[PDB]
Design a protein around this nucleic acid. Structure first.
Lengths: 136, 128, 69, 126, 176, 69, 37, 65
RNA sequence: UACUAAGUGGAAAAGGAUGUGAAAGUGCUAAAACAGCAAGGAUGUUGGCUUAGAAGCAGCCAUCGUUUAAAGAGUGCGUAA
RNA sequence: ACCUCGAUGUCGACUCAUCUCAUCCUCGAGCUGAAGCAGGUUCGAAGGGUUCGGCUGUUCGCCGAUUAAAGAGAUACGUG
């Protein structure tokens, strides 16, 4: 789904996400936030699914910001072929989730509806969802 | 036992008094010879089963929420909070309050006026 | 048939109409044991030949239903 | 809570100590339409008709001109009939509410400060 | 809760004999025995014209057992001094009932005739053949007997036809 | 089929005298038969009369209304 | 009933019950019951 | 009520109650089958003419293909 | 010395749960809180738009006043209003 | 490609079957926008059994007669 319109390199290593939280692990603009539990790979398809689900349950006045992006691309070898003969080929773009980072923030919506929307979104993404209130 | 928004003249319209157990004419004669001055508006009436509904009848003058429009020279209000168009004069306010006094159990004219201004919000009108 | 009775029928015939119709003959028992008739003017009558009724045998009124006449 | 309880106790105790004519009864099953009708009967009087809690009434009677707690906090329904200074229109309301029920069983209070039982209060009412 | 609730007793009409296996309660309405597991934690105190049972120890299992035994004694007393009655209505086209000896036979639309053995200790009253009155002192056994009677026929939602409890009323269902 | 319609006209003519209170209209805008009856079984017996003696069998359609403008 | 892996109350009468150490839900409405979690 | 009618009221006669309402003539065919299915052959219908009215949205599209 | 009532032990995921117990504080209460019971739970109000009278309650909506301890154009059911 | 390439003769078919249950019928139950009849969902249940023909080396596939029902896999797509 989401994708930069120009990338210098085509076949980079995917990630080594093991460690602690990095980057956005707290709410910046939104009043409620989704925080994961373990680092994995997520495809832009699931991210878009979660976002559209939120927007569908989102009010016309509420606003949301995404704190992640499919920065890297997925690379798998084609089907039923032997091992070797160079690397694979690029595929759909993939975002990496670290340990306990925050990836979506929402604001301007009744708090119960906020929790409902976050719970709705959390079942699309492989990581384990957790809710956080605005911690200024 | 039921609640009826009966007419002011005859008592035929409304399938809530033709299936209670009282002859139509037997009560319509008294309703026409007693409520002759109160014909021309939907007037609620109260009935109850005592043996077969042969007695225990009372009138309730029309509520001041659709009359309120006509009382303040407004043709029709609205369903939501709408623009202020109508206004009832003070003398007409006392007249309406003392006409409703029969209907209400309110202990003073001010209580009735407060009730009317409480229901005077679905049409954007001022009762004073 | 299963679900029929005499007293209920002879009450409902007047509950719905009220023509004051009153039975003359008396059916024996109910649905399954109905094989004879007690007339108000004639004595007991019984039906012997099943499958094809051709003879009606008259018999005196017994004790228990005598008052029933 | 206890604070609101005590504040209302003090307020109602003062209100009842100021007044002299105050009688309560247990006549049972009072209804809101019956309450409205009997209030129409008591409309002339500033007398209030209601039922107040038992602890507050018991403390009001403790500060209440021949205290007695056996019936102001016990004995079921406690229907409050307080006519301040004049309890004549309140007496009319009492008569009306006696008519509203099968009979009158006087519980507590009196017509200005000398507690008498139902042997004469029924005659006083009618 | 109900463990602190009073347990009204009448020794002049009811004798309560404590056998650790079966408590024997005897009254003008008969005699009942309570089969109990060994070493019930609850302690029983009998006053003048009253009884009250508590738990010697404090435990979740003991907490449940306190209310359980309090309820058992309460229902036993109510049965032995007042009794229990259950009223049933058999609504149907031609569904009737009769009782012979200690066995209740039915008249249903079933091709196979329907009968039900009645155990001792309970009395069946059939004034109308559509009305059943089960009287006893054993509430649990009365309920069980009613359930065993109703397993052949229960009120259908598509048309009320079965054993109503004189209060069991549901919403009308009709595909037609 | 128009031949079956022509024979059906004669069939209605031959069945009208059977019940003078049986009604058949002929709409001017749509010159087709308009049957009337006392319910479902009435239509069944009429269609049986058409399809047995006259051997003309017709499928039910839908009524038409004047629908002024 | 409905065999599920996650059960939530549907109406006020829908109570999470446990029979024979088996978690189910109960309700007088016949469209709400489930079983086995 | 389940048919969006206009029950003007009910008159009383010797042994019956008669609802005076309005039903479209298009919506009038087959009413006897439902009346029997709702009154078990005892309810009866009288279909008189009082006035015309604008057809609903269904008829205006039924007329033109 | 506690936890455990699954034999966890003796394989296990999302997710679900008045799970068991403990800790940290958070509301009250013996002046009887709360559960239940004898009850009360009214008056404009069939408020009108919509729609039959849809109008305590097909739906919409301002929706506040009055007696009062307490009552909502009613918490729902339920209905033709 | 880690035993086997100094040895596992391999596919379909016949005979002979067997094991398991993610259960086809027969069995039962719960519920249903299931009036009944005709239904559907889910569960328990492996006790039993579950065709013959035309095309074709062929499984499959298509058709016909059907049959209460013509299950899903494995036992080296069993069986030299």
């Amino acid at each position: 789904m989401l994708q930069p319109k120009r990338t210098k390199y085509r076949k980079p290593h995917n990630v080594s996400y093991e460690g602690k939280a990095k980057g956005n692990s707290y709410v910046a603009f939104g009043e409620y936030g989704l925080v994961a539990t373990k680092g994995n790979w997520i495809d832009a398809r699931a991210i878009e699914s979660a976002r559209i689900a939120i927007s569908k349950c989102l009010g016309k006045t509420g606003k949301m910001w995404i704190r992640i992006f499919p920065h890297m691309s997925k690379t798998k070898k084609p089907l039923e072929v032997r091992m070797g003969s160079g690397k694979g080929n690029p595929e759909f773009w993939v975002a990496v989730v670290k340990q306990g980072t925050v990836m979506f923030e929402v604001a301007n919506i009744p708090e119960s509806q906020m929790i409902k929307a976050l719970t709705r979104a959390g079942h699309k993404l492989p990581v384990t969802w957790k809710i956080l209130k605005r911690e200024e | 036992i039921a609640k009826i928004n009966l007419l002011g003249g005859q008592a035929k319209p409304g399938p809530a008094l033709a299936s209670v157990g009282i002859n139509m004419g037997e009560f319509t004669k008294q309703f026409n010879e007693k409520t002759k001055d109160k014909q021309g508006e939907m007037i609620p009436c109260v009935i109850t089963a005592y043996n077969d509904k042969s007695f225990d009848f009372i009138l309730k003058t029309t509520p001041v929420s659709i009359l309120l429009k006509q009382a303040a020279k407004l043709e029709k209000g609205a369903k939501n909070a709408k623009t202020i168009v109508g206004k009832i004069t003070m003398a007409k306010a006392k007249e309406i309050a003392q006409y409703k006094l029969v209907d209400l159990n309110a202990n003073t004219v001010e209580a009735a006026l407060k009730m009317v201004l409480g229901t005077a919000k679905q049409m954007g009108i001022e009762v004073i | 048939k299963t679900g029929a009775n005499f007293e209920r029928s002879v009450q409902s015939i007047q509950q719905r109409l009220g023509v004051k119709a009153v039975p003359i003959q008396l059916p024996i028992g109910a649905e399954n044991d109905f094989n004879g008739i007690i007339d108000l003017i004639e004595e007991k009558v019984y039906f012997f030949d099943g499958g094809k009724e051709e003879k009606a045998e008259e018999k005196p009124i017994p004790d228990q239903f005598k008052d029933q006449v | 809570a206890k604070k609101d309880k005590a504040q209302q106790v003090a307020d109602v105790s003062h209100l009842l100590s100021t007044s002299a004519g105050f009688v309560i009864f247990d006549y049972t099953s009072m209804s809101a339409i019956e309450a409205t009708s009997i209030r129409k009967k008591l409309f002339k009087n500033g007398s209030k008709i209601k039922v107040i809690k038992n602890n507050i009434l018991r403390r009001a009677l403790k500060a209440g001109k021949f205290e007695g707690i056996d019936e102001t906090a016990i004995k079921g329904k406690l229907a409050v009939a307080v006519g301040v200074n004049e309890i004549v229109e309140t007496l009319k309301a009492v008569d009306g509410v006696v008519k509203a029920k099968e009979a009158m069983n006087f519980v507590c209070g009196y017509f200005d400060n000398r507690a008498f039982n139902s042997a004469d209060l029924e005659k006083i009412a009618k | 809760k109900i463990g602190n609730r009073t347990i009204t007793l009448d020794p002049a009409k009811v004798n309560l004999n404590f056998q650790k296996d079966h408590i024997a309660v005897k009254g003008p309405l008969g005699q009942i025995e309570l089969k109990l597991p060994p070493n019930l934690p609850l302690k029983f105190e009998l006053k003048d014209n009253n009884l009250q049972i508590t738990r010697n120890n404090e435990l979740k299992q003991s907490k449940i057992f306190h209310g359980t035994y309090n309820a058992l004694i309460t229902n036993a007393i109510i049965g032995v001094t007042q009794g229990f009655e259950k009223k049933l209505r058999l609504v149907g086209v031609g569904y009737r009932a009769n009782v012979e000896g200690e066995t209740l036979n039915l008249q249903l639309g079933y091709s196979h005739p329907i009968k039900e053995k009645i155990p001792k200790g309970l009395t069946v009253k059939v004034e109308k053949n559509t009305e059943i009155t089960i009287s006893g002192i054993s509430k649990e056994l009365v309920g069980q007997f009613a359930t065993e009677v109703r397993k052949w026929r229960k009120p259908e939602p598509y048309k009320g036809k079965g054993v109503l409890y004189f209060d069991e009323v549901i919403v009308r269902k009709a595909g037609k | 089929t128009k031949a079956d319609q022509e024979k059906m006209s004669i069939a209605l003519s031959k069945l009208a005298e059977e019940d003078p209170t049986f009604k058949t209209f002929t709409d001017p805008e749509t010159g087709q038969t308009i049957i009337a009856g006392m319910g479902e079984l009435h239509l069944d017996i009429l269609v049986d009369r058409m399809r047995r003696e006259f051997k003309v069998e017709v499928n039910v359609g839908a009524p038409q209304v004047s629908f002024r403008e | 009933m409905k065999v599920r892996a996650s059960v939530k109350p549907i109406c006020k009468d829908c109570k999470i019950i446990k029979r024979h150490q088996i978690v189910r839900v109960i309700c007088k409405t016949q469209k709400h019951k489930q079983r086995q979690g | 009520s389940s048919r969006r009618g206009l029950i003007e009221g009910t008159e009383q006669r010797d042994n019956v109650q008669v609802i005076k309402a309005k039903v479209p003539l298009k919506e009038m065919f087959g009413y006897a089958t439902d009346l029997r299915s709702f009154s078990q052959g005892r309810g009866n219908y009288v279909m008189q003419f009082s006035h015309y009215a604008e057809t609903p949205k269904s008829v205006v599209n039924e007329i033109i293909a």
